[PDB]
Amino acid sequence: QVVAAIRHITTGTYIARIREEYQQTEVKPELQPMKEALARMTDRAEALIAFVTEQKDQELLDFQARRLVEMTAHAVFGHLLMLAANDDDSFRQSAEVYLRYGQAEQEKIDSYVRAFRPEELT
Amino acid sequence: VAAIRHITTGTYIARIREEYQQTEVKPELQPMKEALARMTDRAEALIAFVTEQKDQELLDFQARRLVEMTAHAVFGHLLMLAANDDDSFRQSAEVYLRYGQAEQEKIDSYVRAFRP
Structure with a gap:
């Protein structure tokens, strides 16, 4: 049910789109660090999904x-904002701050999920 | 200079109103669409507050x-569209909107508090 509603998440359909389309976007050097940071966030999401799913x-x-x-x-989301900043570099500074937010929130989730003991559930 | 001209042009305010806000979204995202319109109005208002001083x-x-x-x-509109495409992302989009709202409030208060 919740599992069903998120089958595309566990399978990684957005991960594939990120890698096959968004990460193939040619960006100027000024946005290249953001592109590389987003690639790391994508790998982190995939890895955390694997951490959970492999427990069966x-x-x-x-x-x-x-x-x-x-x-x-x-x-x-970070990629959508990167694409906005690629189209108009006026938005790069703002996009970079949203990147920090996304990184912070990913870290909180990753830490929580990885520290969680499955025995806590009934 | 790249910034300043866009600001005095209003291009992105026009973009949201003529493009983004003309997208008809799912009924469950209409509240978000309306909140985004108000964030747009707030931006326009603050820009006018500065530019009208000549x-x-x-x-x-x-x-x-x-x-x-x-x-x-x-950015808020882009995330709304992501959520319109996939309801899985609605909650995440809402949280990002609240973040944007909070940041807008800080910028608005700061700019309107300015003195030389």
């Missing part, structure tokens, strides 16, 4: 589902 | 802030 614990997946969605959203 | 030093001083102010509205 359906209750855990259901519990962590919304966090895995969020983890992915930070990477996707 | 003070080029002030506009130069505030130009980056005015672009940031606008960026929260622009």
